[PDB]
Amino acid sequence: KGKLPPGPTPLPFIGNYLQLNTEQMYNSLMKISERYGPVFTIHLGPRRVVVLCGHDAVREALVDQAEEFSGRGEQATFDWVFKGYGVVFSNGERAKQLRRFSIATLRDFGVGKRGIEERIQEEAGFLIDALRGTGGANIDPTFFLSRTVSNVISSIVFGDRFDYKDKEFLSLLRMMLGIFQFTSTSTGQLYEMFSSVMKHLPGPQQQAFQLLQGLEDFIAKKVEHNQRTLDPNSPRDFIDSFLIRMQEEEKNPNTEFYLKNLVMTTLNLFIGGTETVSTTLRYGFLLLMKHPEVEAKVHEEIDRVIGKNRQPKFEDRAKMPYMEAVIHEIQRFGDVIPMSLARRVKKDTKFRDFFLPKGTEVYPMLGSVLRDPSFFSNPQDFNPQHFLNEKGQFKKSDAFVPFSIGKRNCFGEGLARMELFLFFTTVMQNFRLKSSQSPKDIDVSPKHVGFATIPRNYTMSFLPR
Ligand code: HEM
Ligand SMILES: NCc1ccc(-c2cccnc2)o1
């Protein structure tokens, strides 16, 4: 046809705003999908976006035409501070350069090796101590979990972990939680459409920018310190490595290795490597309390395979199919980044029967793939069986795409999975979960859903076993 995917007729500037509920972007788009198809065009304010719903559409584009869909789209709130710099929100040469270096440097500091595994085990140990410190009292787990998670990636980029009593550390975690919630509210999704006006208007978006600026200032501060103490022969962390590469590229006019890309890339890892996993853990514990039978089987498998003495190690996952199914189901049900991070066609593209002009933005609806009724029998329920065969053995699914897929997929996936398995397992090994209310009354529906899926606030107690 040579034409863009079908979709509701947009109005000047506001686009399809009148046919969308900013507080429920996902449901609005899915409803529109019922009449236009799994592949349609939507106008988020002036942003023309091609929406991909369901496993087939998403995989066909991001994997089968991986290079064509390898461009990075926008996320207005984050672009406020990033401005196209850094590894995540960058495109072309800058993205290729920063991503290759980041993956390599991450591996140099233990990611994927025994080095980081030991780091996660030790930090898991610190979480256990902290949980024991609550004396079984009812608590908000939120920051107990984010502190532990953040310390893993923090060890890599800053060279050392934060003290759990570090007030400034708590401030930063609050900033990350704040930005994740904002981008998932009605105002945050409205911002994605009308940032051209809103970035200049009073409102919640301004407070959001301040949280981001607070994070950037902290990073800039850390970089400055490392600069005034850098050992070119012995890098201490991710920042040092980049600083070294920068020195080596000082004679290259068009190098991508300069201060701003260092600050933004480090900020990317600090935020991206913290809040995502933290959120998953938080939702996970809530779901396990909502389903005692699942916790029971988890404990059964842990006691048998690992016991009550030694610390869980990453290799234990191979001998624990149920736990593997449980973590997968948590990520599937959790649907933490419901619409992924926007992609964009790098050149004129022919997708299925449509035409996508170069630069077109793309919304891979990851949540629609994680609940694709063709891949999971009861997508709306939380059931580990979704990842298990009759034999109780772990069964993979092509529809398991919480980290997205393709050329700009999450390269933090390996670390994330090691953290999820080690933290979930070490916690369940040591504690029994006690909810504030009867299971049947626990609400596992999300508090907010926009850029991310945010679970409702809750308290709980960790009872030693
Ligand atoms: C449960 C945890 C996590 C989830 C659900 C998650 C999810 C995602 C998603 C959906 C994307 C976009 C993929 C795409 O464009 O196709 C992504 C990007 C990215 N993630 Fe994660 N992530 C997680 C953890 C991590 C961790 C631990 C790190 C940091 C070490 C990290 C770093 C990144 C980076 C740097 C990108 C941008 C990649 C690029 O543009 O080339 N993520 N993540
Ligand atoms: N790891 C995926 C993910 C979710 C949100 C973000 C993020 C947000 C702000 C800056 N850099 C990365 O990254």
Curated annotation (Swiss-Prot):
Result, substituting residue 165 to E: In allele CYP2A6*15
GO terms of biological process kind: coumarin catabolic process; coumarin metabolic process; epoxygenase P450 pathway; steroid metabolic process; xenobiotic catabolic process; xenobiotic metabolic process
Protein's cellular compartments: Endoplasmic reticulum membrane; Microsome membrane
Effect noted on mutating residue 450 to V: In allele CYP2A6*5; loss of activity
GO molecular function: arachidonate epoxygenase activity; coumarin 7-hydroxylase activity; enzyme binding; heme binding; iron ion binding; oxidoreductase activity, acting on paired donors, with incorporation or reduction of molecular oxygen, reduced flavin or flavoprotein as one donor, and incorporation of one atom of oxygen
Domain of life where this protein originates: Eukaryota
Substitution effect: residue 409 to Y: In allele CYP2A6*24
Binding-site residues, heme: 410
Organism name: Homo sapiens
The encoding gene: CYP2A6
Enzyme class: oxidoreductase
CDD domains: CYP2A (cd20668)
Protein family per UniProt: Belongs to the cytochrome P450 family.
Catalytic activity reported: 1,4-cineole + reduced [NADPH--hemoprotein reductase] + O2 = 2-exo-hydroxy-1,4-cineole + oxidized [NADPH--hemoprotein reductase] + H2O + H(+)
Protein's name in the database: Cytochrome P450 2A6
Effect of residue 81 to L: In allele CYP2A6*24; increases phenacetin O-deethylation activity 4 fold
UniProt xrefs under PANTHER family: CYTOCHROME P450 2A6, CYTOCHROME P450 508A4-RELATED
Gene3D superfamilies cross-referenced by the UniProt entry: Cytochrome P450
PROSITE patterns: CYTOCHROME_P450
EC numbers for this chain: 1.14.14.-
A Pfam entry, by short name: p450
Effect on the protein of changing residue 389 to D: In allele CYP2A6*28
SUPFAM superfamilies hit by this protein: Cytochrome P450 (SSF48264)
Main subcellular location of this protein, as a coarse class: endoplasmic reticulum
Keywords: Endoplasmic reticulum, Heme, Iron, Lipid metabolism, Membrane, Metal-binding, Microsome, Monooxygenase, NADP, Oxidoreductase
Keyword Zinc in record: no
GO cellular component entries: cytoplasm; cytoplasmic microtubule; endoplasmic reticulum membrane; intracellular membrane-bounded organelle
